[PDB]
Paper text:
The S-adenosyl-L-methionine-dependent tRNA 4-demethylwyosine synthase TYW1 catalyzes biosynthesis of 4-demethylwyosine (imG-14), the precursor for wyosine, the hypermodified guanine-derived nucleotide present at position 37 of phenylalanine tRNAs of archaea and eukarya.
We determined co-crystal structures of the flavodoxin-like domain of the putative Tyw1 from Schizosaccharomyces japonicus in complex with flavin mononucleotide (FMN), exploiting an unexpected anomalous scatterer present in the recombinant protein. Our results show how eukaryotic TYW1 enzymes bind the coenzyme FMN and will help further elucidation of the structural enzymology of 4-demethylwyosine synthesis.
Residue numbers in the entry: 81 to 249
The structure:
Amino acid sequence: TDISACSINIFYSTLGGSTQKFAEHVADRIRSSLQTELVEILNLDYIDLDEYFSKGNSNTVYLVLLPSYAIESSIDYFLSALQTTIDDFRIVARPLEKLRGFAVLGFGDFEQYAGDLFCYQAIAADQRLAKLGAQRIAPLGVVNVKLEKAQVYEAMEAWTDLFLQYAKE
Ligand SMILES: Cc1cc2nc3c(=O)[nH]c(=O)nc-3n(C[C@H](O)[C@H](O)[C@H](O)COP(=O)(O)O)c2cc1C
Ligand SMILES: [Mn+2]
Ligand SMILES: [Mn+2]
């Protein structure tokens, strides 16, 4: 089903508030690029995760904007809820097979967390959504939030545009 025809859910998590601001900006760029009012932003901390990640509609896209935290955070709970859904016998295999698809954008600090930790929770989200049967529309994007602010914005704008291009092919 056509991307312009789809309802678009933008999930995010935030401790410091930057990923919220970035999710508003990604939402506004998608709204203006597709001339659609079918874009919603959802804070993963305020949402019933089984309702969204245990079942999906053919006319729905999921975008996941996720910072990474090496400390324990609500994001740990998001990733565990995905793993529980993959593993629990009481839930069917590939419950998101009917989703139009999904893409992940991760935020991380390369200066401090270069290596296995850089955007590690966005990498895990991308792998687990694919194991839930959701078709990946675009490759995982990562933004180093220690670049200049102009470059952080240019990076998530290029990823939003690549996402819209892939979704139209
Ligand atoms: C305590 C702490 C731990 C962090 N751990 C990681 C990490 O493991 N990997 C990473 O890529 N970035 C890490 N970062 C950088 C954050 O992901 C980044 O600052 C992100 O923009 C936070 O978004 P928020 O403002 O929406 O919470 C960490 C930052 C802090 C303050
Ligand atoms: Mn529930
Ligand atoms: Mn429920």
